[PDB]
Design a protein around this ligand. Structure first.
Ligand SMILES: CCCCCCCCCCCCCCCCCC(=O)OC[C@H](CO[C@@H]1O[C@H](CO[C@H]2O[C@H](CO)[C@H](O)[C@H](O)[C@H]2O)[C@H](O)[C@H](O)[C@H]1O)OC(=O)CCCCCCCCCCCCCCCCC
Ligand code: CLA
Ligand code: CLA
Ligand code: CLA
Ligand code: CLA
Ligand code: CLA
Ligand SMILES: CCCCCCCCCCCCCCCCCC(=O)OC[C@H](CO[C@@H]1O[C@H](CO)[C@H](O)[C@H](O)[C@H]1O)OC(=O)CCCCCCCCCCCCCCCCC
Ligand SMILES: CCCCCCCCCCCCCCCC(=O)OC[C@H](CO[C@@H]1O[C@H](CS(=O)(=O)O)[C@@H](O)[C@H](O)[C@H]1O)OC(=O)CCCCCCCCCCCCCCC
Ligand SMILES: CC1=C(/C=C/C(C)=C/C=C/C(C)=C/C=C/C=C(C)/C=C/C=C(C)/C=C/C2=C(C)CCCC2(C)C)C(C)(C)CCC1
Ligand SMILES: CC1=C(/C=C/C(C)=C/C=C/C(C)=C/C=C/C=C(C)/C=C/C=C(C)/C=C/C2=C(C)CCCC2(C)C)C(C)(C)CCC1
Ligand SMILES: CCCCCCCCCCCCCCCCCC(=O)O
Ligand SMILES: CCCCCCCCCCCCCCCCCC(=O)O
Ligand SMILES: CCCCCCCCCCCCCCCCCC(=O)O
Lengths: 38, 65, 37, 115, 28, 33, 34, 505, 341, 82, 30, 57, 32
């Protein structure tokens, strides 16, 4: 069944996702605002 | 160059050098499979490491009987 | 059938000879004690 | 001792009688030789990274330099442009004389201290 | 507990004071 | 001393084989010039 | 006309802010008695 | 001309001679395999798989043939000790011969492809230039790999059309080649479950067939083709090297920690079994069980199989060797002949004392005897003048239960100390040191030698990956940087985006 | 002109600190590795894993603070904060050694990020990637010593702890248990590091002492312009000097600087290999010929037998306190000791 | 030879810089001071105080000996001090 | 035999020094 | 006899050393910092036992 | 069989040394 470590695994998995998604979310926004002029 | 019978048979398998699908093609799909495989390898690693402990999975020699 | 066009001369100058022989001889000097053990 | 294992004997007994590892002058000697090796690699790799194309791929790039030629054989501005971006601009030399003086000074001074 | 608020007070005050002094130029 | 008997042939080919390789390449370089 | 907040500003304060906090904590530690 | 370190680049644009070179390399490898096997056969002693198994004898390729079902010699012996058996053609000798024949055949094909390099197959039909369609080659080769991987799992390993693989009990006592049924549940990802190895090859084989189908039919996107330089065969070398050092690290790890594919009757015990007293616990479990059912001490220890006792000995621990201590383990401590029995030490008051075992970290270890509580009660002292715990003062004795010395007791302190010095190594065996002129110093096993070599090659191949990957992405500046590089491209602020001339300020 | 190219644009802007795609991996991991070491050395004990104090908070100084390895009983556990050992409790995670795996793994991924950054910047500027390649050597050292080595042993406990003195203890351990000074792979490393330092000093001094007079000042630094085409020192006079002083000299500037890359990079790679062997206790501990003779002939003595007595002292005298999980009790009477001392 | 950010030398000689930082720097210093002086650091990181390395008549190290009960072991040691 | 081997390699190195110095390829200006 | 206790340490190849273990052994502790040239020994045999070559080198 | 152990090295060098000599002379003939 769903043991404590499998629960921890999902916690670690979702936390990583949050960190990467938040980071990329911010990085995309900034890059949209402050573009280079060609 | 020398032509041979086997050569003429295999010819079309080596006839599309440089042909690409446009732009990003299936790159979004590739990334999905990569991410699943990463999770898959994490699980397998953490099972072996005993960081992920699963019911009925005794990571020991004693799992031979 | 033409001769193979990809063939190339190879070179080792005298300084590279001296450097390589020194490498080999010093390695042998280093490892010989461990081979005889 | 004038021997390889004798050198080691000397080191070990020196550590028991003087605790040389916890002595700052030995710690500076390590910084001198580790930093010396580091900067040897750095300088070697930055100059090698910025060799000016003078040869074909079938030949050693070393043949692009001729003993006594007056021109420099690499582009120091490109090397500086690479290293200053690797870190930040002002942690990279653009004066070759200051650079080579630094190469000389760091290991010499560290080994003075360890002696 | 209370020791957390004690620690965090100077940081929040300093962050406040920097905000006050820089806000006009940050808007520009 | 009771050393490994094979250490001698090991050392001898360790010297001989790569040295011969370099000498071969050197000599045929000279005769091009 | 220079910008105030930059990537550089973040890098600088990412290091500078904890450095001063740690310095304060380590200074307090010199007065701990056993 | 070419420097020595670049001679083989003449094959980069020559697919025929590239194939000839690959054939020659394959002939060499197959030839090594056959030669190695013949040498091992000529030196292997099959007469005692209990105390002189293959792994004590420095056998390296023998266990890989046994792992997949080759177990007998044309000479009539088998590695499980059955005598008078008939393996058919796939004996150790027949496998060795096959590889040799295979080598010879590859060598002739190498010659043909070297001479007849200029095949039209290798020419791009549009441009007339040598070209390989690497994307399609990958899908073909992957599809093939997938079919082989599937077949190997679906037929060989299951025993549906094949022999199965080596399986054993947890204590390495009764191993044999058996067909193995797949494990499809989560315990199939358990390294110690042999059914998982079957399921892996079946599933991965199907996935490989499907991905291969995909890679034959679907062209690479243009973004990826340009990013990975898919027109450059050296990108393949770069990623192939990476996949290979990945694989090498994995097989070093599983060899060292142990898994279902590195069984201990073929490669020896692991160091962790010594660390955790794995075999001593089982032995004690059995002796306690014989005592409870009413057996005497003599009887309970005499029931301990010699093979299990021999695992409980530090000389079979693969972390007790050295780099230049060469040859089989037998060359060090000797050829094990017999278990002497289980040594029990007691002091003059009759308490049982316990020798503290040597940890794998220590070349030498002192002799210290403890009571059940771990309190020191005797030792062999270094300085004698202030000794409290000597064997002489404490009246230590040793009695033997089981084995060769069963029922015997020794009381003369020098003999008792002698067995105490052996007991730090675990169970005590009689060795033949004469036959091989053994020097008495521990060597590592094939498990140790294989891990070492594969961990080192993996690390080195990581450099090859960095090297060839660099050469792939920087092909245009391999011979030097643009002599017309202008300082505005490498100076600061000129371009908004580094190296993009269209972003000039 | 989608989001990917726009983000590429922004990552690769010329700014005071270049970011790049490699920055996404490098900057978090480098900062966390660094931050974990400063946090641990300032505040965190080693009492429950090692029986040691190891933070400023506890009374240690810069030389003796460390982030210490986890307890031997953790094996090779990743020791994730959310894993089954700490169970999400930050405090217990610290006390169990979690900061060690945290620093080592983030440090590993930071090293990758830094080498990717070298590739990225070199590609954008148009130089060859030899600085990246040179950096493979410190990578090999790090992974072999901090990861491969303890992975072959019983646990992370036997990896180096991250501290000045703790590394000093690592060196001495390797002398007594592995006889690492006798290892030819370490010896090649030594030659590469000492040889690199020598090359560094001798090249810097030669250049500075074969300069051309290019200005009138007594400070010769000012007489160099980064855009000048002319060599700033005389290869020819440098070659003559060294030929007459030493017999041989460099004559090819490209070879010279490549050699400077080669020597220390190769030396570090060689030592990494030896440490991989020591992961398995595959040491160069002994010479068998010497031991056979010395066992039979009590008048035979060499600097090799003298050093093994020192190793034997190191092991017996440091094991009980250095490996507290083993519960080694060595009574006075078993300690090896010479006369008087 | 510039990428657009304001020169450091110009910043740290400016009056506005020191109006902000003559506050923010001592504040951060005092914050860290209090982190320690209040005893919070001991509690957050689990670091023993000078009176809590050993129980009064104990001279054994409370060494963790179990991987999966490690947490409970530390907790058991600490209760032998309360 | 081991002594002979050690000294032989040493003497080959000394001989190499002699050729490397006195029979080097001469550096030639440009 | 490096440490002056009549416990002679073998350093040369012919007396059972290899390249790694061989050494020219330091002069005897019995001599300390005294100058020990050849002509101060009663014989070369003595000079060799007490470590004379080290000082010369 | 109790054979002479210097037999191996004597045979190896008997083959290698004169063989290498000829290979050296032949290769430098082809490149000139
Ligand atoms: C170069 C570029 C570098 C870039 C790299 C970037 C960083 C990537 C980070 C990598 C993370 C590595 C974590 C590996 C953890 C590990 O291994 O953890 C170890 C575990 C195995 O666990 C260990 O297992 C041991 C043996 O156990 C077995 O034996 C016991 C004794 O009988 C019992 O039976 C027990 O039940 C049974 O399971 C002990 O129990 C140890 O305490 C326990 O830690 O493996 C596992 O997780 C998985 C092991 C299989 C995969 C092997 C890959 C690891 C690569 C190392 C290869 C070299 C090996 C070193 C040898 C040289
Ligand atoms: C007709 C083919 C054939 C057969 C039946 C055998 C059979 C055997 N060989 Mg021989 N061999 C062959 C051809 C063959 N060989 C050839 C062509 C060569 C030259 C390369 C050799 C070289 C060789 C050596 C050097 C050795 C053997 C050995 C052996 C024995 C053990 C096999 C083993 O453990 O493999 C192990 C299997 C692997 C290593 C396969 C791993 C492959 C990786 C994981 C796949 C890579 C990724 C993949 C492409 C991704 C797929 C995608 C997926 C989604 C499907 C066995 C008796 C061993 C032996 O005992 O010798 C006497 C040994 O040491 N062989
Ligand atoms: C993966 C490779 C592999 C592995 C693990 C083994 C493992 C084993 N073999 Mg096998 N073997 C192999 C390949 C391998 N072999 C090959 C390719 C051959 C053909 C040459 C043989 C031929 C062979 C024979 C003839 C015998 C064995 C035996 C053995 C056993 C003892 C090994 C031993 O003492 O090593 C000793 C290992 C070393 C001393 C390590 C050497 C490391 C070198 C010196 C380092 C070089 C460093 C380099 C110069 C530095 C350069 C750096 C700089 C220039 C840049 C062991 C089970 C023996 C046995 O027991 O058989 C029953 C035996 O008699 N093997
Ligand atoms: C599948 C593996 C593979 C393949 C096919 C290649 C192929 C190639 N390499 Mg790469 N490489 C690899 C692995 C590989 N490499 C690895 C693992 C490393 C790290 C060590 C490197 C490091 C490397 C460098 C640094 C360079 C190359 C270069 C080259 C090219 C020229 C090589 C040559 O002429 O050698 C000629 C070699 C010799 C004549 C003698 C080599 C003798 C060695 C030292 C010892 C002998 C090994 C022994 C016989 C058997 C091997 C045992 C074991 C590996 C199986 C060629 C495309 C060169 C290049 O880019 O040129 C443009 C180059 O400069 N390679
Ligand atoms: C690029 C940055 C980066 C990288 C590479 C790492 C890498 C690592 N960290 Mg570090 N970390 C980072 C940034 C990073 N961290 C940052 C920014 C912080 C501060 C928040 C931390 C704080 C931190 C802590 C506190 C710890 C780590 C730990 C770890 C390790 C385990 C990671 C793991 O298991 O992830 C698992 C997760 C992933 C790999 C993400 C996979 C993404 C999947 C595919 C997406 C799945 C989809 C989603 C879940 C679906 C949503 C459905 C929903 C609606 C239900 C590893 C060395 C641990 C450690 O060092 O142990 C010693 C640990 O305890 N990290
Ligand atoms: C003449 C004396 C001498 C010399 C020159 C060396 C030289 C060497 N030794 Mg040896 N050693 C010696 C004596 C000596 N040793 C003796 C007598 C002993 C006792 C046995 C040892 C025991 C010993 C051990 C036990 C080990 C060495 C190792 C090494 C190597 C270290 C390589 C290196 O730079 O690691 C430095 C570390 C790295 C390069 C790793 C990556 C570093 C990254 C880039 C860090 C980035 C820092 C980052 C910015 C944050 C910093 C900020 C913070 C400080 C504030 C090198 C070959 C090591 C080795 O062989 O490794 C394979 C090793 O583990 N030595
Ligand atoms: C922009 C901002 C960028 C921020 C920079 C941050 C980079 C990371 C910081 C790196 C510096 C690390 C130094 C920490 C020293 C420290 O805190 O000591 C803090 C300790 C505190 O002092 C200890 O305090 C204890 C309190 O219980 C006890 O009283 C001890 O007796 C007492 O020793 O001080 C020292 O040990 C001695 C002071 C001098 C130390 C000098 C060491 C630094 C010089 C060494 C070589 C350089 C190191 C850098 C290269 C590696
Ligand atoms: C649980 C998850 C925890 C992690 C959370 C994830 C988020 C972390 C993301 C960190 C990225 C930080 C980017 C900083 C940008 C910034 O603040 O200033 C950018 C703004 C405007 O600055 C501008 O500065 C520019 C120069 S530069 O880009 O800053 O170099 C200039 O172009 C412009 O004119 C000027 O206005
Ligand atoms: C022709 C022919 C034939 C024959 C064949 C033959 C006879 C073959 C053989 C083959 C062989 C017989 C092969 C072998 C091989 C080998 C090898 C290939 C080896 C290798 C080695 C190496 C590589 C090593 C290395 C090393 C060293 C030396 C030291 C240590 C380290 C190392 C390991 C690295 C036949 C009849 C079939 C048919 C028809 C045709
Ligand atoms: C771990 C962790 C984390 C992180 C953290 C961090 C990030 C931190 C950082 C920290 C920091 C970042 C810190 C810093 C500090 C610093 C210091 C402490 C400094 C010091 C200095 C010194 C003392 C110096 C001095 C000097 C000298 C001596 C000489 C010259 C001058 C000078 C001044 C330099 C988290 C949260 C994620 C969670 C998990 C865990
Ligand atoms: C639904 C099909 C999934 C089950 C396949 C058979 C696996 C049964 C479990 C096992 O035998 O390992
Ligand atoms: C892909 C890189 C992953 C990067 C982020 C991974 C780690 C980020 C933070 C995750 C740890 C914080 C939350 C988990 C704390 C555990 C508490 C619990 O177990 O309930
Ligand atoms: C290479 C220069 C010649 C030096 C030769 C000196 C050899 C002296 C050592 C003699 C070896 C001792 C016993 C040999 C018997 C086998």
């Amino acid at each position: 069944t769903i043991t404590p470590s499998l629960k921890g695994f999902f916690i670690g998995l979702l936390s990583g996702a949050v960190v990467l998604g938040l980071t990329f979310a911010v990085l995309i926004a900034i890059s949209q605002i402050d573009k280079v002029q060609r | 160059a020398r032509r041979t019978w086997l050569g003429d048979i295999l010819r079309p398998l080596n006839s599309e050098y440089g042909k690409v699908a446009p732009g990003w093609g299936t790159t979004p799909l590739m990334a999905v499979f990569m991410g699943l495989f990463l999770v898959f390898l994490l699980i397998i690693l953490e099972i072996y490491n005993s960081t992920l402990i699963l019911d009925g999975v005794n990571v020991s020699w004693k799992a031979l009987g | 059938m033409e001769p193979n066009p990809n063939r190339q001369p190879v070179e080792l100058n005298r300084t590279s000879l001296y450097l390589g022989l020194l490498l080999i001889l010093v390695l042998a000097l280093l490892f010989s004690s461990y081979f005889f053990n | 001792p004038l021997g390889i294992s004798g050198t080691f004997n000397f080191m070990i007994v020196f550590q028991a009688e003087h605790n040389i590892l916890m002595h700052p002058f030995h710690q500076l000697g390590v910084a001198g030789v580790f930093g010396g090796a580091l900067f040897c690699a750095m300088h070697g790799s930055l100059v090698t990274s910025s060799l000016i194309r003078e040869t074909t791929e079938t030949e050693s790039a070393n043949y692009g330099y001729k003993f006594g030629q007056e021109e420099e054989t690499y582009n120091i501005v490109a090397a500086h442009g690479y290293f200053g971006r690797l870190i930040f601009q002002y942690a990279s030399f653009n004066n070759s004389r200051s650079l080579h003086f630094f190469l000389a000074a760091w290991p010499v001074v560290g080994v003075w201290f360890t002696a | 507990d209370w020791r957390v608020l004690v620690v965090l007070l100077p940081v929040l005050l300093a962050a406040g004071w920097a905000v006050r002094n820089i806000l006009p130029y940050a808007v520009k | 001393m009771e050393v490994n008997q094979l250490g001698l042939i090991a050392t001898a080919l360790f010297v001989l084989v790569p040295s011969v390789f370099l000498i071969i390449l050197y000599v045929q370089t000279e005769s091009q010039q | 006309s220079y910008p105030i907040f930059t990537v550089r500003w973040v890098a600088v304060h990412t290091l500078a802010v904890p450095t001063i906090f740690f310095l304060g904590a380590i200074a307090a530690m010199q007065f701990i008695q056993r | 001309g070419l420097p020595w370190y670049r001679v083989h680049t003449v094959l980069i644009n020559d697919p025929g001679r590239l194939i000839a070179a690959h054939l020659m390399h394959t002939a060499l490898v197959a030839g090594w395999a056959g030669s190695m096997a013949l040498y091992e056969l000529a030196t292997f002693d099959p007469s005692d798989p209990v105390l002189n198994p293959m792994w004590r004898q420095g056998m390296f390729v023998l266990p890989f043939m046994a792992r997949l079902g080759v177990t007998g010699s044309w000479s009539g012996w088998s590695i499980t000790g059955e005598t008078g058996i008939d393996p058919g053609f796939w004996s150790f000798e027949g496998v060795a011969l096959a590889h040799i024949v295979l080598s010879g055949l590859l060598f002739l094909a190498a010659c043909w492809h070297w001479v007849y390099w200029d095949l039209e197959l290798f020419r791009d039909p549009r441009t007339g230039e040598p070209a390989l369609d690497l994307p399609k080659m990958f899908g073909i080769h992957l599809f093939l790999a997938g079919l082989l991987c599937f077949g190997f799992g679906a037929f060989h390993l299951t025993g549906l059309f094949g022999p199965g693989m080596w399986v054993s009990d947890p204590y390495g006592l009764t191993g044999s080649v058996q067909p193995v049924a797949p494990e499809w549940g989560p315990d199939g990802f358990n390294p110690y479950n042999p059914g998982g190895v079957v399921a892996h090859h079946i599933a991965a084989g199907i996935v490989g067939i499907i991905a291969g189908l995909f890679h034959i039919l679907v062209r690479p996107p243009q973004r990826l083709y340009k990013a990975l330089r898919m027109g450059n065969i050296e990108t393949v070398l770069s990623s192939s090297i990476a996949a290979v050092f990945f694989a090498a690290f994995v097989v070093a790890g599983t060899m060292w920690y142990g898994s279902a594919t590195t069984p201990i009757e073929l490669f020896g015990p692991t160091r962790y079994q010594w660390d955790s007293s794995y075999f001593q616990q089982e032995i004690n479990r059995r002796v306690q069980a014989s005592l409870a059912s009413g057996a005497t001490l003599e009887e309970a220890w005499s029931a301990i199989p010699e093979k299990l006792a021999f695992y409980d000995y530090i000389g079979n621990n693969p972390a007790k060797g050295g780099l230049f201590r060469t040859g089989p383990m037998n060359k060090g401590d000797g050829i094990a002949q017999a278990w002497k029995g289980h040594a029990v030490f007691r002091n003059k008051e009759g308490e049982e004392l316990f020798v503290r075992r040597m940890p794998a970290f220590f070349e030498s270890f002192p002799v210290i005897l403890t009571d059940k509580n771990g309190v020191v009660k005797a030792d062999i002292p270094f300085r004698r003048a202030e000794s409290k715990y000597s064997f002489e003062q404490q009246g230590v004795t040793v009695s033997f239960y089981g084995g060769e010395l069963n029922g015997q007791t020794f009381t003369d302190p020098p003999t008792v100390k002698s067995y105490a010095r052996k007991a730090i190594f675990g169970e005590i065996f009689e060795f033949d040191t004469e036959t091989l002129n053994s020097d008495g110093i521990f060597r590592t096993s094939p498990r140790g030698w294989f891990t070492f070599a594969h961990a080192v090659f993996a690390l080195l191949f990581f450099f090859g990956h960095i090297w060839h990957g660099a050469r792939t992405l920087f092909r245009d500046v391999f011979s030097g940087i643009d002599p017309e590089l202008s300082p505005e491209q490498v100076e600061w602020g000129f371009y908004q985006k580094v190296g993009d001339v269209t972003t000039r300020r | 002109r989608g989001w990917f190219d726009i983000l590429d644009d922004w990552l690769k802007r010329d700014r005071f600190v270049f970011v790049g795609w490699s920055g996404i991996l490098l900057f978090p991991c480098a900062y966390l590795a660094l931050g974990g070491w400063l946090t641990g050395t300032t505040f965190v004990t080693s009492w429950y894993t090692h029986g040691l104090a190891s933070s400023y908070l506890e009374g240690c100084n810069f030389l003796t603070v460390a982030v210490s390895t986890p307890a031997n009983s953790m094996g090779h556990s990743l020791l994730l904060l959310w894993g089954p050992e700490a169970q999400g409790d930050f405090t217990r995670w610290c006390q169990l050694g979690g900061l060690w795996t945290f620093i080592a793994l983030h440090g590993a991924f930071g090293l990758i990020g830094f080498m990717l950054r070298q590739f990225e910047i070199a590609r954008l500027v148009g130089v060859r990637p030899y600085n990246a390649i040179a950096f493979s050597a410190p990578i090999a050292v790090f992974v072999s010593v901090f990861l491969i080595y303890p992975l072959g042993q019983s646990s992370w406990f036997f990896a180096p702890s991250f501290g000045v003195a703790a590394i000093f203890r690592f060196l001495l351990f390797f002398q007594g248990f592995h006889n690492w000074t006798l290892n030819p792979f370490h010896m090649m490393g030594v030659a590469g590091v000492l040889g690199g330092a020598l090359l560094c000093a001798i090249h810097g001094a030669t250049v500075e002492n074969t300069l051309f007079q290019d200005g009138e000042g007594a400070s010769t630094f000012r007489a160099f312009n980064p855009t000048q085409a002319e060599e700033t020192y005389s290869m020819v006079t440098a070659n003559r000097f060294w030929s007459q002083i030493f017999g041989i000299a460099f004559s090819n500037k490209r070879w010279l600087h490549f050699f400077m890359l080669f020597v220390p990079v190769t030396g570090l790679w060689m030592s990494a290999i030896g440490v991989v062997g020591l992961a398995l206790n595959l040491r160069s501990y002994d010479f068998i010929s010497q031991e056979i003779r010395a066992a039979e002939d009590p008048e035979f003595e060499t600097f090799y037998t003298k050093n093994l007595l020192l190793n034997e002292g190191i092991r017996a005298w440091m094991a009980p306190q250095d490996q507290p999980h083993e519960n080694f009790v060595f009574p006075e009477e078993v300690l090896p000791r010479g006369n008087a001392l | 030879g510039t990428t657009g950010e304001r020169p450091f030398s110009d910043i740290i000689t400016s009056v506005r810089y020191w109006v902000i930082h003559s506050i923010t720097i001592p504040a951060l210093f005092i914050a860290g001071w209090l982190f320690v002086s209040t005893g919070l650091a001991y509690d957050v990181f689990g670091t023993p105080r000078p009176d809590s390395y050993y129980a009064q008549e104990q001279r054994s190290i409370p060494l963790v000996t179990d991987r999966f009960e490690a947490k409970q072991q530390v907790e058991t040691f600490l209760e032998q001090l309360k | 035999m081991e002594t002979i081997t050690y000294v032989f390699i040493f003497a080959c190195i000394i001989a190499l020094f002699f050729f490397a110095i006195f029979f080097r390829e001469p550096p030639r200006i440009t | 006899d490096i440490d002056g206790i009549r416990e002679p340490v073998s350093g040369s190849l012919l007396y059972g050393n290899n390249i790694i273990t061989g050494a020219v052994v330091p002069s005897s502790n019995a001599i300390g910092l005294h100058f020990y040239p050849i002509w101060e020994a009663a014989s070369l045999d003595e000079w060799l036992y007490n470590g004379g070559p080290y000082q010369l080198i």
